[PDB]
Amino acid sequence: NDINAEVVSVSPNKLKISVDDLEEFKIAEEKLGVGSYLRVSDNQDVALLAIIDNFSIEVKESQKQKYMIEASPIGLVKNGKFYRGGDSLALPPKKVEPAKLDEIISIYSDSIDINDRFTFSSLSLNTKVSVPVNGNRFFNKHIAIVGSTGSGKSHTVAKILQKAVDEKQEGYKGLNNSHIIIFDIHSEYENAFPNSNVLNVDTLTLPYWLLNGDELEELFLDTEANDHNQRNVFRQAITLNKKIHFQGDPATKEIISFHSPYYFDINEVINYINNRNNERKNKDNEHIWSDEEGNFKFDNENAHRLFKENVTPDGSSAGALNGKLLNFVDRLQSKIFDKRLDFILGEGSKSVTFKETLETLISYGKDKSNITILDVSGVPFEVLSICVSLISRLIFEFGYHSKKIKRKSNENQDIPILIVYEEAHKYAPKSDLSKYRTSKEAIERIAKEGRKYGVTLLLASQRPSEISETIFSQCNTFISMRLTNPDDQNYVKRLLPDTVGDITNLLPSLKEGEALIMGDSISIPSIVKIEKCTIPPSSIDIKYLDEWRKEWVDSEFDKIIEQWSKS
């Protein structure tokens, strides 16, 4: 016949197959490649199916051509139904044929229910078979999409999210329940999702008072200094400022702490700390001050007066914290006065609400969308770790507090939330440096614990080796576009469970848009072809050659300088 192959040797998870004739050559081209499927049986009703790990076609002078195929049994097919597992044993010899289209279809269409299928790709070797994944297990366990630059990582991220948005239950018209937050460093997904809310630095107002105890100390204090007096005055200035601005029930007022998410004014906190740097005491160790209303002594009732700058110290001896906060105050107002931090520390954070901030992040406000794109291209890099950690913790804790409402009402969580981390190694590096410490633990607690609170990850990174192994291991779904860096290839090999012969060196040779999906969502790890984005993630970037080719511009330079003076 066209193909005459049979199994010559078996092993626990391993078959050696000798192709004897190979009469028709196009069988070997597309049906005998690495990752193809083989039917291993003697009858036409019960068979095993086998992925192809390796092959070798030796040809010599006089002896026959030695086509040996290295295969591993992926499961068992019985009368049109596929059963996973390499436990079943083929006693050699067994006739080997390429698997038919119905057999490859039944591999992926049997382990997943009809309502649990999430199709966004097709098999690379056989276009006519689509590859669904367990969409519950796809998103509930964290996803890591890795690959080199130009491999199609961002198109694959968007095509997963467009299929998540476009899919709906029958009987309703309108938006679906899905909630996706994208951290956009390159501003690509704005075009991919036109009817979605996009928040860049100019419009996104992140309140600084929503920063917790760790993040507020990370933004302003120095970890390396570790000054207990500077830390203590920073906490008590902020805690008092949260109290005096509270407009509510006095019972809620008493439980307000440094970490409680209430509005405080950062200008008043600087004034109080600058005031306590100028402390003076009398001969009774009590700091005495004079302001417009009169003389007063620093105590719990009168400590709110120090928020006003227009006070003068009146004491014979230097105060307790006198001459100890001068470096702290200079650092404190260096962050405030910088215009790049105006979205997080400006006047817009005064008028924003805690509820309004949550509605902004998951797009629950006036304009509702499944996809929220955070264009953090304009965020300065020193606060990229601060801002990612704030939004991730604001989403995890919302996901945690969603569950604690629902357990009192004895319900499950109504909304799940996916967060997409483009360029994920910048937030969460392998390095233990303190400058990216706060963004690591925010993504750590979602990776380790967010599974139970409806908060999950989509780690999209070019250099997976730089991602921390602790966050990368908590991911269970793994999509590899194309890895050409050998350090990246070896790290992912150590991070991919089992799957020998498939992840080995197929990843360098993968074409654009061609990916390897593995995890509990997919039945077997397979090379798939991610379907084309009709609405692609285009990033508007500067084409230097096209701008350098044209005329030297002269009218533009005068406009840049004068607005710099204006701003």
């Binding site: 028709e24 050559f25 196009k26 081209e29 040809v59 010599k60 002078e61 051509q65």
Partner: protein, 244 residues
Amino acid sequence: KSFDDQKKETIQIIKNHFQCEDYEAEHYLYSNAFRKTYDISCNKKDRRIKKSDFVESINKSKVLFNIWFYQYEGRKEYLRKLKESFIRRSVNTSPYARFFILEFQDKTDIKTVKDCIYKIQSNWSNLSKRTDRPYSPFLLFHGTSDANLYELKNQLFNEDLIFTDGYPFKGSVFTPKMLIEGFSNKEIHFQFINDIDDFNETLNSINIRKEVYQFYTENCLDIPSQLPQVNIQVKDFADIKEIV
């Protein structure tokens, strides 16, 4: 309805009529329809012709040579569109019994036609000393004198291009089994079918897949229709080398 816009419309209406593929709707069906348009330009008494006659005549198994796209595309561009449309190759061409029927006149010299034979032999044969299924092309020449046909065979043998024709000695009958044995012979570079009568006798003695690549200028033969045929009309023999 510009020059390119009208060209796109006639392809689609041809594809709607036959429900066939697009590679031969433009390069095989469109070219034969244009040839019959100029063929009825000499005597133009008929403007309404039924579709059972005009469309039937252009839907032959033959690809006629069009002079206008030969001039509009050019010599290199026209032969390039006959590469990608009919003679499609792969990296792993299979050992099939390929038959090459080439049309011979007395005006064509031997040296040009030799250059087509070494083009056919080097491209359509794998006589490798390591291979297990070697294949060699079958060559048929027709329309010529026997003196010119025997002259071409003599100079092919002198330059170490060993062939067989089913006549292993003088006075031999046409034994066809030398051609099939010469097909799988590593030391026989190609087969040489002498005339039409040996072509049909050879076809019944081969069981593997047979393909026929006819290339003609004036006349073409009525070869049987079950085997795949690929017929190109060319202007001259020098165009066959850049096609195969």
